[PDB]
């Protein structure tokens, strides 16, 4: 949020989940974020370059973390032939 | 209600200040337009009843409030009971409730009134302890 001066005033801006778009609480210990690096031809992944996904504790407890991660990787192009929108 | 002979009382029923003579065949029939847009019915224009307590061919005048209701009891001579339905607002619950009140009105023979027969009436001075209205328009349920 911003005041009249236009400067963002708050303790922090909580990270929104990448699957269901929900706020991750400060004590949401079930929520985790995973990182997958970028690989070129013949392995030898490039250091310093990676894409991260945050999965909320509610999703992980419900058991939808695997499917949500599969969907996110398919959208970002890091995974193929495992997640189908048609179902 | 039912068209009977106009001389059905102990006295002679005649329109006041209406005269018959020889130079002119009998006399004339007097009528007035109650105003406010209501048209005098053709039966009243060419009829035979007297009905001193009638907005047409009579002496009572229509003035005051104009109301509309539904006939609930037409079991009296030249007089019927109508029912007015309205919703009363109770502020505490912010809701409404059904409220009804019965109104007694006088009816001319020019109108045939049964149950239903949404009638529009107008105030025409007290008639007998309850009747301050006269029927001016009829919305028939059959026509």
């Amino acid at each position: 949020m911003e005041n009249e001066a236009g400067q963002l005033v708050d303790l922090y801006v909580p990270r929104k989940c990448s699957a269901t778009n929900r706020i991750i609480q400060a004590k949401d210990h079930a929520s985790v974020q995973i990182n997958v690096c970028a690989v070129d031809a013949e392995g030898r992944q490039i250091p310093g370059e990676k894409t991260t996904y945050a999965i909320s504790g509610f999703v992980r407890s419900k058991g939808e973390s695997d499917d949500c991660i599969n969907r996110l990787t398919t959208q970002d192009g890091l995974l193929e032939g495992v997640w189908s929108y048609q179902r | 209600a039912t068209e009977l002979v106009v001389q059905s009382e102990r006295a002679f029923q005649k329109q006041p200040h209406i005269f018959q003579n020889a130079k002119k065949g009998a006399g004339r029939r007097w009528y007035k337009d109650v105003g406010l847009g209501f048209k005098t019915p053709a039966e009243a224009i060419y009829g035979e009843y007297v009905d001193k307590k009638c907005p047409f061919v009579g002496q009572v005048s229509i003035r005051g409030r104009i109301l509309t209701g539904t006939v609930v009891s037409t079991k009296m001579h030249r007089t019927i009971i109508i029912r007015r339905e309205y919703l009363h607002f109770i502020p505490k619950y912010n809701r409404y409730e059904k409220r009804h009140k019965n109104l007694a009105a006088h009816v001319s023979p020019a109108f045939r009134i049964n149950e239903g027969d949404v009638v529009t009436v107008g105030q025409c001075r007290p008639l007998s302890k309850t009747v301050r209205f006269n029927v001016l328009r009829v919305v028939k349920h059959t026509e």
Partner: protein, 129 residues
Amino acid sequence: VRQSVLADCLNNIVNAERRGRRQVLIRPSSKVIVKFLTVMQKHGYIDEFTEIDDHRSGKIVIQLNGRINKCGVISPRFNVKLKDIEKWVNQLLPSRQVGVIVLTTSRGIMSHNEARAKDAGGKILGFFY
């Protein structure tokens, strides 16, 4: 018997949002539902929705993008004047800047802020935030 399809539509939407599903199916469909969905979609709470047109009342498939805490109906539809909007906002809305109250005023179905700009009251349909 179904008394109000708008209540069923909003209850299905809020249930799906709580469950975390990104799509929801509403049956049947009506102009009031379409107008309500348009209002929240214009305000940004609802993604694209498609109306399946069978030879019946119809069906709606709505894409849910989160960012909805609760959407509900206000039954019976109380008549709301201009001065009653503030009371309804205080009673239902979380604050004076967050949330929308939908009123079916004389000029159509729209938000409480837009109706206040129109300077016309009406009947309260529901709320969403």
